[PDB]
Amino acid sequence: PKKNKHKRKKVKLAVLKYYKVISRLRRECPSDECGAGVFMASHFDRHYCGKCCLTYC
Amino acid sequence: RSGKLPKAFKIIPALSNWEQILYVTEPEAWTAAAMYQATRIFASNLKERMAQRFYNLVLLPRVRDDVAEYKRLNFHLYMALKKALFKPGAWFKGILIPLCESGTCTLREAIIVGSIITKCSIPVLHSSAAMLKIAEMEYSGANSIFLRLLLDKKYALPYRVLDALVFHFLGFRTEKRELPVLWHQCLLTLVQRYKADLATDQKEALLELLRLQPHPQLSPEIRRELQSAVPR
Amino acid sequence: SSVMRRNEQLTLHDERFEKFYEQYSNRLQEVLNDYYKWDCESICSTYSNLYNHPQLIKY
Amino acid sequence: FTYRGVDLDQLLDMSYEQLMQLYSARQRRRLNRGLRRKQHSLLKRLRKAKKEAPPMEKPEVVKTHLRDMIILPEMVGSMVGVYNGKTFNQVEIKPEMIGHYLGEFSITYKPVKHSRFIPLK
RNA sequence: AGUGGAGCCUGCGGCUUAAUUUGCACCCGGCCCGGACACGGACAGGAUUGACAGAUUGAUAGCUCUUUCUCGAUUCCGUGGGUGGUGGUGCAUGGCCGUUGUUGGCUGGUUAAUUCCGAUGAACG
Ligand SMILES: [Zn+2]
């Protein structure tokens, strides 16, 4: 039952999925500190901002 | 003791009037794990300057009077100080240097935060700033420990920093007061790491320093390392 | 500062120190509402000593 | 089955406050002194276990350390596992179990299961 | 007068036990952390930090198990019979206590009450 430390999933080129060719494939955080680059996590039911932690469903 | 923190406590990094919020939270009455979590949230998602203000106001007097009380550092306090080290610039300008001109730093706090220095890799530019701002200030029994350990970091030393350090050693010409074996240990680490970056005038300068300030045990090592140094 | 200086051999970087010495809400109400039988010695009696004997050469 | 001349259906329909007189003095004093947060917590967990069960067979097993629950008629039919210090014992709450503590049904100790010289010369 | 007999309680042994701690110390489960030095690996194509929600769990929890958002050099992987340091421990060692007379000198609430809390010096031998 030894506690193994968590290891981050090193995904190849995490940046290369929010754009085309131009536009934003993910929407933008509408907050004050967040926007114009703070991209929106889109899980299968829900939406996440990684800085200010807004909960959008 | 344990369990999830309230979500009203994790919004203080984004909260404006932080001073009254922390004051009504009574900073002197915290426990160790709560302070560790506070340093975590104020060193992870926070900026530089108000995190530095946090380091000045709360963390430094608490660690100071705690090691005054118990002559050791608590486990959660050590983790909190490491998490404060996770942001380099705020920690240097908020914890290390304020304790440096505090003047009342003891040997135990110095060796504890020097061990904390040695346990993590720091940026070279912040280390050079630390060496400049510690060489510009007066000598005690505590700042030399950071001199010795941050020379033991063995980074690419800027040469203005070297001029400042040798200018401090110029500051020690004719004083009679017996500086300890740790002084010669700092000189030993300096001549062990940066003997290849010294010009000739530095060589005879430390030679006449050796003549004026002798040591029955480590000074032959200083003569050996000065005489066996490859010029830059 | 000082007066005895480099004089030779390739200063790499330019040693920025000017930032060190001279340095010295709907979500609020939202989270406010969110607030409220054998051993090693006995088994030796099991082993026999009468099966695989080498053939004996007599005198 | 009946308990003090009362059947289980209206026992579930009886109140919390006048069920108290049907029990013994220890249980009545405990019900006087209130139940704590873990008590209603495991009550909600066993209710959730009963709710998500298919209606033909018994629900899933809910396990706990908490040995000082009094078995109430709400819990009749539940699948409860109680820690006896080392392991969990899984037991079905019968209607006959209606007064006792849960900790009576997982014993924390094991039963104790425990040549003369004759002269030859 | 007893004890040694009987029932019950207790102490050492011994036996059972995960433990039946010992001349809360014990047991069963869950957290948290845990060197530098050297050399070889990964690292801006990205090292690594933080995290809502759901779950495992006896319970919750980015301290873990899912799904991605963000912090970016504040780095993290392996091998050493090489040291070791928030270690424990004695000696020499500098400062500092205590140790081997005499005469003076009220905003506030609160109670039976100059009640309670609360702000608020000198010489002589
Ligand atoms: Zn945002």
Q: Where are the alpha helices (DSSP H) in chain B?
A: 18-24, 32-44, 49-54, 60-70, 75-85, 88-91, 97-102, 107-118, 124-135, 143-152, 159-171, 181-193, 200-212, 219-227
H or E element, residue D10? helix D8-13
Please, which experimental method was used?
Answer: cryo-EM
Q: Among B167, B170, B171, B176, which Cα is nearest to B213's?
A: B176
Contact predicate A49/A26, CB 8 Å: no
Report how far residue B101's alpha carbon sits from residue C27's, in angstroms, rounded to the nearest whole number. Answer: 41
Q: Among D81, D69, D68, D12, which Cα is nearest to D43's?
A: D69
Q: Which distant-in-sequence residues (6+ apart) come within 8 Å of A21 by Cβ?
A: none
Report how far residue B178's alpha carbon sits from residue B106's, in angstroms, rounded to the nearest whole number. Answer: 18
Q: Pairing between strand A46-49 and A40-43?
A: antiparallel
Q: Which distant-in-sequence residues (6+ apart) come within 8 Å of B183 by Cβ?
A: B144
Radius of gyration of chain B (CA): 20
Q: Among D103, D18, B148, which Cα is nearest to D4's?
A: D18
Token couple for B7: 């979500």
Q: Could you state, in order of their start, the residue ranges of all structural domains in chain D? A: 1-114
The amino acid that residue B105 corresponds to is: C
Contact predicate A29/A54, CB 8 Å: yes
3-class DSSP state for residue D70?
strand
DSSP designation for A29? -
Q: Could you state, in order of their start, the residue ranges of all structural domains in chain B? A: 1-232
Report how far residue D94's alpha carbon sits from residue D88's, in angstroms, rounded to the nearest whole number. Answer: 18
How many CA within 13 A on the CB side of residue B135?
Answer: 25
H or E element, residue A56? strand A55-56
B156 touches chain C (CB under 8 A): yes
Report how far residue D62's alpha carbon sits from residue D80's, in angstroms, rounded to the nearest whole number. Answer: 5
- Apex B98 CA angle, B92 and B101, nearest 5: 125
The amino acid that residue D73 corresponds to is: P
Task: Please state whether strand E lies within 7 Å of residue B5 at its CB atom.
Answer: yes
B165 torsion bin: left (phi>0), alpha (psi -120 to 50), beta (else): alpha
Report how far residue B57's alpha carbon sits from residue B95's, in angstroms, rounded to the nearest whole number. Answer: 10
Strand order in the sheet with A40-43: A40-43, A46-49, A55-56
Q: Pairing between strand D79-83 and D88-92?
A: antiparallel
Report how far residue D109's alpha carbon sits from residue D90's, in angstroms, rounded to the nearest whole number. Answer: 17
- Resolution of the experimentally solved model in angstroms: 3.1
Query: Which of residues 39 to 78 on B have a Cβ less than 7 angstroms from any strand E atom?
Result: 40-41, 44-45, 72-75, 78
Report how far residue D86's alpha carbon sits from residue D109's, in angstroms, rounded to the nearest whole number. Answer: 10
Q: How far is A32 from chain B (nearest CA, A)?
A: 11
Report how far residue B229's alpha carbon sits from residue D43's, in angstroms, rounded to the nearest whole number. Answer: 78
Token couple for D69: 């629950």
Residues of B in contact with A54 (CB under 8 A): none
Report phi then psi at D7, rounded to 5.
-90, 160
Q: How far is B159 from chain C (nearest CA, A)?
A: 7
Please state, in angstroms and as integers, the Cα–Cα distance from residue D83 to each residue in B130, B217, D40, D50, D68, following that order.
57, 66, 18, 21, 11
